[PDB]
Design a protein around this ligand. Structure first.
Ligand SMILES: *[C@@]12=NC3=[C]C([C])=C([C])[C]=C3N([C][C]([O])[C]([O])[C]([O])[C]OP([O])([O])=O)C1=NC(=O)[N]C2=O
Length: 107
């Protein structure tokens, strides 16, 4: 079971532009609160800053990356998010979008 989003990398802070219905159902947030925003609103008190940095750098360098993050639903309850971000390039080598697969691996 997994969810999927698309971030717009032509915009400077990679706002989310599409999300599967499972992403909304998993996180508790609506498209009115997800679209146009950077994915980091799902982070909170216990999110590991060393892991958050791995994504920050892979996004700046335009690489693929996979990290384990503690995330929080709209109602405040936490869950463990296995997150893999893939860069999507244009033919001229520039990154156009980042795509994300999120798995809830709280098991
Ligand atoms: C988030 N999923 C997610 C999906 C995509 C496609 C991208 C590009 C990023 C994410 N993030 C992280 C966020 O956008 C940001 O990259 C990181 O927070 C690190 O950079 P900052 O600005 O914080 O230093 C996701 N973050 C989550 O917590 N949950 C996801 O599902």
């Amino acid at each position: 079971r997994h969810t999927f989003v698309v971030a717009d990398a032509t915009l400077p802070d990679c706002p989310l532009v599409y999300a599967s219905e499972g992403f909304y159902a998993m996180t508790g947030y609506g498209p009115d609160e997800v679209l146009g925003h950077n994915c980091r609103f799902l982070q909170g008190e216990g999110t590991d800053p060393k892991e958050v940095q791995k994504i920050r750098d892979a996004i700046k360098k335009g690489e693929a990356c996979s990290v384990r993050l503690l995330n929080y639903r709209k109602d405040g309850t936490p869950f463990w998010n296995l997150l893999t971000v893939t860069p999507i390039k244009t033919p001229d080598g520039r990154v156009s979008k980042f795509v994300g697969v999120q798995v809830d691996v709280t098991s």
